[PDB]
Amino acid sequence: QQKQRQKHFNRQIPAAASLIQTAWRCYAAENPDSSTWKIYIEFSQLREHHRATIKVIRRMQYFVAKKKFQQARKP
Amino acid sequence: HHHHHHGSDYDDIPTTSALKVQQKQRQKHFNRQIPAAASLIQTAWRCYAAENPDSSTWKIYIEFSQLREHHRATIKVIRRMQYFVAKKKFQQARKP
Amino acid sequence: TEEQIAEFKEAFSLFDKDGDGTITTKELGTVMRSLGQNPTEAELQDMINEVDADGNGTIDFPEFLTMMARKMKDTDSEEEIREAFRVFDKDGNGYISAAELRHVMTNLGEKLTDEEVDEMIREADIDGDGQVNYEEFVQMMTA
Amino acid sequence: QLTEEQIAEFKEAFSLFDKDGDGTITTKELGTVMRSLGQNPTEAELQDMINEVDADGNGTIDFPEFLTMMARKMKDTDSEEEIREAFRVFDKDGNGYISAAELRHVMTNLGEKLTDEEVDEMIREADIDGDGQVNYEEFVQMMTA
Numbered sequence A: 001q002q003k004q005r006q007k008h009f010n011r012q013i014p015a016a017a018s019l020i021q022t023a024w025r026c027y028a029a030e031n032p033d034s035s036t037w038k039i040y041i042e043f044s045q046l047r048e049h050h051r052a053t054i055k056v057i058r059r060m061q062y063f064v065a066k067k068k069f070q071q072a073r074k075p
Numbered sequence B: 001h002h003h004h005h006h007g008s009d010y011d012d013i014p015t016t017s018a019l020k021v022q023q024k025q026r027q028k029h030f031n032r033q034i035p036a037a038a039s040l041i042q043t044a045w046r047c048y049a050a051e052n053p054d055s056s057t058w059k060i061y062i063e064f065s066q067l068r069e070h071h072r073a074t075i076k077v078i079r080r081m082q083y084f085v086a087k088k089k090f091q092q093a094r095k096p
Numbered sequence C: 001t002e003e004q005i006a007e008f009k010e011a012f013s014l015f016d017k018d019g020d021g022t023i024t025t026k027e028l029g030t031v032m033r034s035l036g037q038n039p040t041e042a043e044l045q046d047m048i049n050e051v052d053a054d055g056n057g058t059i060d061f062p063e064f065l066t067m068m069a070r071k072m073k074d075t076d077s078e079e080e081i082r083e084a085f086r087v088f089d090k091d092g093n094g095y096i097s098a099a100e101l102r103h104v105m106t107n108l109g110e111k112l113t114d115e116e117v118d119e120m121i122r123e124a125d126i127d128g129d130g131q132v133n134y135e136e137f138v139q140m141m142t143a
Numbered sequence D: 001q002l003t004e005e006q007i008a009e010f011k012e013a014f015s016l017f018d019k020d021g022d023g024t025i026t027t028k029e030l031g032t033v034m035r036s037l038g039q040n041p042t043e044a045e046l047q048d049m050i051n052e053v054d055a056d057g058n059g060t061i062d063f064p065e066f067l068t069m070m071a072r073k074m075k076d077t078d079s080e081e082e083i084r085e086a087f088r089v090f091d092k093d094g095n096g097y098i099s100a101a102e103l104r105h106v107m108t109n110l111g112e113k114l115t116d117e118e119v120d121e122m123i124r125e126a127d128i129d130g131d132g133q134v135n136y137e138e139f140v141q142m143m144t145a
């Protein structure tokens, strides 16, 4: 009977941890930021690639707009 | 060809606006500055706003912003499914 | 509300790839696999069964809605989390050491990342010397 | 100002445009990226962007040329005045202020068009309002911090 009670409690610990974890991940998923979305590798990388290309393009568009304004003001 | 041999110092004004042609050249000159000035400010701010991972400037990319909405949605659904499974499975371990 | 409904219908379509109005285990698996995960056939069948109410092995839109409307707050979906902390509480005391929390969180069940646990302990914001008030961690999640 | 992290960053960014892995960025390559980002820029706009970067004049951007632009200063002295005098153009009143209504117009209806949400962000981040005025002289400083 002592072993039956121990193995019963032994199967409790994983269910224990999992419940807290699954409950927190639901709570964390409501925050658009937070580090819980960084666990998705390909997509987090896809965001980095997305923000990278844009920041490069926007700076290219900046210097073009900058030079075009310098030309437009030359009397 | 030939030699000038000085002038004549002869005083007289036969023959013969330009104020209309240059005033139009001045109006058109400034007219070109309006689009350029706005574009400079716009591009400069978009470089500034791009440094912020949040901000509304990333919502201008439709397909990707929707791709994020779809991404978060599927995950929210799965995580709740996993919660109820972890919920039921748990006190199935708490039922002597 | 009209927003919530349109929300859920879009979410449903994201799983029902075939547009046949039902979600199968392999459809859920495809989504989870594309999200960088590899879950067992048993894990998919467990998830489907927790939602499937008619017992036909598939999730239709009403079944989907029903899950998305299930309360995760108040009264008591709050014990199961509150006592969820029972197993790891050696001392009776409603606190657990930050070191311990990190352990059970990082090394058991769904494992979780350190950054996620970093977020956990920071957000908890309670710790006198070395103990964590998990019943104020429960209240936090179930707001 | 070159760090090991920054260097690896820029090399990744370059590869995102040079799909062909040829060590150079073409107009059609830039166009493909911009097109996949929900935009449709003219052939003139693409070659204009390349020319502002292309220093050797071969019509293509190599990695050193890319690095040089990404290292170009966007602050202080000669980039701050120019944004300022860009604001002067719309500054009808001499006084260094412009109405929020006007700003919204110029921002939303001219040049790169911009979204309302973006202009909303502008005026909110601005946090200036004497009745209805915007201190564009501190918005310049804000961007160039």
Ligand SMILES: [Ca+2]
Residues within 6 Å of the ligand: C015, C016, C017, C018, C019, C020, C021, C022, C023, C024, C027
């Ligand atoms: Ca289906």
Ligand SMILES: [Ca+2]
Residues within 6 Å of the ligand: C052, C053, C054, C055, C056, C057, C058, C059, C060, C063
């Ligand atoms: Ca069903």
Ligand SMILES: [Ca+2]
Residues within 6 Å of the ligand: D018, D019, D020, D021, D022, D023, D024, D025, D026, D029
């Ligand atoms: Ca190339």
Ligand SMILES: [Ca+2]
Residues within 6 Å of the ligand: D054, D055, D056, D057, D058, D059, D060, D061, D062, D065
């Ligand atoms: Ca070149």
Ligand SMILES: [K+]
Residues within 6 Å of the ligand: A047, A050, A051, B058
């Ligand atoms: K993004």
Ligand SMILES: [K+]
Residues within 6 Å of the ligand: A037, B068, B071, B072
């Ligand atoms: K996301």
Ligand SMILES: [K+]
Residues within 6 Å of the ligand: A040, A041, A042, A043, A044, C034, C035, C036
């Ligand atoms: K992913």
Ligand SMILES: [K+]
Residues within 6 Å of the ligand: B061, B062, B063, B064, B065, D036, D037, D038
């Ligand atoms: K896009």
